Each structure stands twice: as structure tokens, then as C-alpha cells.
Amino acid sequence: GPVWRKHYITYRINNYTPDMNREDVDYAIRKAFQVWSNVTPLKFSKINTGMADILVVFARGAHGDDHAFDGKGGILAHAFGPGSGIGGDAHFDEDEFWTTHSGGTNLFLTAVHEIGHSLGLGHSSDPKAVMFPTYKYVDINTFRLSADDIRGIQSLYG
Ligand SMILES: O=NC(=O)CN(CCO)S(=O)(=O)c1ccc(F)cc1
Ligand SMILES: [Ca+2]
Ligand SMILES: [Ca+2]
Ligand SMILES: [Ca+2]
Numbered sequence: 001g002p003v004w005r006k007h008y009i010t011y012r013i014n015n016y017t018p019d020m021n022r023e024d025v026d027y028a029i030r031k032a033f034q035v036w037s038n039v040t041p042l043k044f045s046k047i048n049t050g051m052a053d054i055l056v057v058f059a060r061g062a063h064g065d066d067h068a069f070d071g072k073g074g075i076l077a078h079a080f081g082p083g084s085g086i087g088g089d090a091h092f093d094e095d096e097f098w099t100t101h102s103g104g105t106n107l108f109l110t111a112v113h114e115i116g117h118s119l120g121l122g123h124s125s126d127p128k129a130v131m132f133p134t135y136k137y138v139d140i141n142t143f144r145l146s147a148d149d150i151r152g153i154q155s156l157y158g
């Protein structure tokens with residue numbers, strides 16, 4: 001499948017969920033990128049203007065791709081694999097309630113999974129993997145990728 005063919009990757013936060021403090025959205029997304037830069041040669045930089053490799057969007061219902069959101073619950077987020085245009089982009093359903101903690105849906109944990117997709121990972125069948133298709137809260141302060149996640153990403157990079 002497609003991978004980024006360069007080491008310096010940019011992201012931009014298109015818009016901010018009203019569910020969270022702005023600084024907390026920034027930090028959750030930054031931390032989620034760091035999870036992956038920890039285990040690859042990739043470097044991620046937030047840009048505030050122009051065309052980024054990975055655009056982070058909060059939207060609800062139909063939002064201009066072939067992947068309409070479904071209200072609260074169900075689909076929480078989706079992301080596109082590496083490529084031009086919308087490739088790499090990560091979309092979060094605004095009908096969820098995003099948080100920094102165990103309440104609602106945790107943005108950081110969801111973003112780790114979505115960014116996995118943005119980097120070219122598919123889903124894992126291993127329930128221990130962040131790339132497992134089902135969302136479940138785990139303590140964010142001690143979060144670690146599973147062995148399966150690490151072997152998956154290192155099959156693509158580094
Ligand atoms: O990447 N998007 C998906 O895989 C779609 N989901 C459905 C499968 O039940 S999810 O939104 O539940 C979802 C989103 C992020 C996660 F970390 C887990 C589940
Ligand atoms: Ca939803
Ligand atoms: Ca893109
Ligand atoms: Ca919301």
C-alpha cells in the first residue's frame with residue numbers, strides 16, 4: 001500500500017471542536033503524532049497556513065467525501081492513506097464528544113489510530129493493538145503501542 005516517501009511530514013488543524021479547550025486539541029494531536037515518530041524516522045510539524053500532508057478536520061454528517069458521518073456513536077473518525085490531495089487527511093465526527101480523559105471519546109487515543117491510517121496502516125485483528133477496529137478507553141498517561149502496531153508501522157517505515 002501507499003506510504004509517505006519523505007521524512008518531514010506536515011499537518012494542519014483545519015478547525016477545532018467546541019468540545020475541548022483549543023490547547024488540549026493541539027496537545028492531543030501533537031502527542032498522537034509523537035507516538036508514531038517514536039518508532040519511525042518520521043518528523044511531524046504543525047503548520048498554520050497552506051497545504052499540509054495531513055489535514056485534521058472536525059465535521060458532522062456529510063462533509064464532502066464518500067464517507068458521511070452517522071451522528072453520536074458508531075463511526076468516530078476516519079482517515080485516508082498516504083497520497084496527494086485528501087490523502088493522509090484525518091476526519092473526526094463532531095457528533096462525538098471529544099475529551100482529554102475517559103469521558104466521551106478520547107481525542108488522543110482516536111487520533112493515534114487515525115494517524116496510523118494516515119501513515120498507511122490498516123486494521124489489526126489483535127484486540128491489544130491501537131489499530132484494532134474497536135474504540136476502547138485505556139489510560140492515556142501510560143499508553144503504549146502493541147507489538148502488532150510496532151511491527152505494522154516498521155513494515156512500512158524505518
Ligand atoms: O479509523 N476509523 C475506523 O476504523 C472506523 N471505526 C469503526 C469500527 O468499529 S471507528 O470510528 O469505530 C474507530 C475509530 C478510531 C479508533 F481508534 C477505533 C474505532
Ligand atoms: Ca459517529
Ligand atoms: Ca492530504
Ligand atoms: Ca462534538
Ligand SMILES: [Zn+2]
Nearest residue numbers: 063065067091
Ligand atoms: Zn471524512
Ligand SMILES: [Zn+2]
Nearest residue numbers: 113117123133
Ligand atoms: Zn480505523
